[PDB]
Symmetry: C3
Subunit: 258 residues, 3 copies
């Protein structure tokens, strides 16, 4: 069942651990590195400089490590990096960084990126994230761990999707989504916290209730942004889980000297 299909193209410069597979008609461009036990499906296109970790499954029609088309980037020799145990479904596009930001697009471990999703220049994904069909990260988007972006979720240049956060389908996210928050619609608004994926992480009930309290503070008490960050302080010493939520909201607003 013999590993690297002969109908596939591998650059001499590319370099692949022993038990990597490549389906037919797939291209492994120059400067592409593929870690142990990874599988490249048929009709894939890898371009470098790109570093793909161990035990990844990448499917057909996927164009992983292409240049961003954005005119900003004029071909400077930037990187893409993918961790281990990731799944990249049919037709996904992942673009390498631009020198303008950190010169690298980056994906962690255990992520599920479903069909026709896009991950633009300089975006950065943590672990156990799910990007559903046609989710699109315009560029320099940071997605912290466990986040779930429902189908056709759109995320504007530079937004931070905090951890365990959740976008509903057709969400149009123009600004940061705090840890644990559920957001919906065009343009994205906050609704609740994601109690779902909190029970899934086996959070204590005190921690859940405390996170509801925390939501209520920010949003439904109309404190200012600053006013609420202040309130949470207590809540956040008490519960590392809340801490995260305060910390998300923190480094979204620095504001100016009024």
């Amino acid at each position: 069942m013999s590993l690297i299909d002969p109908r596939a193209i591998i650059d001499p410069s590319a370099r692949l651990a022993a038990d990597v597979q490549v389906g037919p008609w797939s291209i492994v461009g120059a400067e592409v590195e593929i870690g142990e036990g990874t599988v490249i499906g048929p009709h894939v296109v890898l371009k470098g400089p790109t570093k793909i970790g161990k035990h990844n499954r990448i499917y057909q029609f996927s164009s992983v490590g292409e240049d961003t088309p954005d005119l900003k980037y004029k071909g400077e020799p930037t990187r893409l990096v993918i961790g281990d145990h990731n799944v990249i479904r049919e037709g996904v596009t992942i673009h390498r960084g631009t020198v303008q930001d950190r010169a690298e697009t980056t994906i962690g471990d255990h992520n599920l990126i479903m069909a026709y999703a896009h991950i633009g220049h300089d975006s950065v994904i943590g672990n156990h994230c799910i990007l559903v069909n046609n989710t699109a990260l315009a560029g320099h988007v940071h997605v912290d761990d466990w986040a779930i972006l429902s189908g056709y979720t759109l995320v504007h240049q530079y937004c931070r999707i905090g951890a365990h956060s959740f976008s509903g389908m057709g969400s149009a996210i123009g600004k940061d989504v705090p840890a644990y928050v559920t957001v919906f619609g065009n343009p994205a608004e906050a609704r609740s916290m994601n109690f779902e994926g909190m029970r899934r992480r086996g959070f204590s009930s005190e921690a859940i209730h405390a996170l509801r309290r925390a939501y209520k503070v920010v949003y439904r008490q109309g404190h200012t942004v600053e006013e609420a960050l202040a309130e949470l302080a207590e809540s956040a010493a008490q519960f590392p889980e809340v801490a995260v939520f305060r910390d998300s909201i923190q480094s979204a607003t620095r504001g100016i000297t009024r």
Copy 2:
């Protein structure tokens, strides 16, 4: 002159009626059955167990019969079934069922499914439906006959699109769409009935007027849901066409004992 391109891959286990064609670089995975007079374009990917009926036209970059990525499904050996005279345009994805629901994703006859559309695990399509570009059925979605989903229509797990119904472009359907109803926007709201595709079916004028009356009852009289189902009763004996509309609304709301 030559039917099945030599550059295409056909599993020994696959089985294809005499005058089937397959374009180059297309893969017909194991357990894939293709009925009389069907045409598979170039760069297609079929995976099984999948049964494709007669006189279908499937285009390039289409991944028909892949497993749903949803973690729910752990590889149990489920099915896809496609009827006759269907068209599947460029880049369509169709996923086979999960044992959790009916273990089968199902498509009827005479359907037009346009480019980059998605038909998730366990979805079920009738006949003469049109799914326009990038329409997406999250899973277990039933689309009854003649329905038209305009481009980039999104349909949440388990929703029923009643017959002759119509979604506008970028519709975000979170709940059932009754027979004949036009819905628009994010989130989808009702606007009118689809008089268009009623004239197309050559409905009697009494039947059209009766269907307007019926709409008005449900929606624009603010009867309850139950209250309206009651009203329609008369309307629905009188006109098989209305009957359908009542029947759609019926088995969307069972409610609980208050």
Copy 3:
């Protein structure tokens, strides 16, 4: 370092200037003409009658010059035309015209059409336009020069996107967008003029201020449409830039005899 890959398929009827390149597994259907210095990536599909100008870059999974699926078109032998210095990113679909309108889909010069974008039957694109990821022109859409459609912008049959206009991401454009106007959301509303791409064109400050005045007139003074066209008259003699804006608004409303 010999230009047309041997694993690619070229119709004898197709015709390609000397220094054209074609990547592997790409098909150049009959009646396809490709101008000097153009590059066709791997796994592309060209179909004709199609005329592609000079120095274009077309990427993988792109299906350029296929028939529109719309049932309106019954195979009449219509055309696609693409100018020079265009970029067509991964997975783009471009459909040839229908005899019903002008029998031709048309693209000018220096345009950037990003991944998974769609350009339906009879649409018409000027120069230096950017269509971002998954932008979709349903059909007979005219996009005048310098226009920018942010990602997942949807444009209903027959709309005119005036020059330097700008749609935000997930915009759902059901009606004309005047020159220079910024529109956002579902359904698209007007917000501002696109001062951005005005500074980019090096417009005089008088011209910018005059264009703000002009916006204010149409929209924020609630003159009628006709009433405002009247006002602009002066503004529009004075400034060719305004002229454009009046002219966009003009041939969107002919109205009827009341």
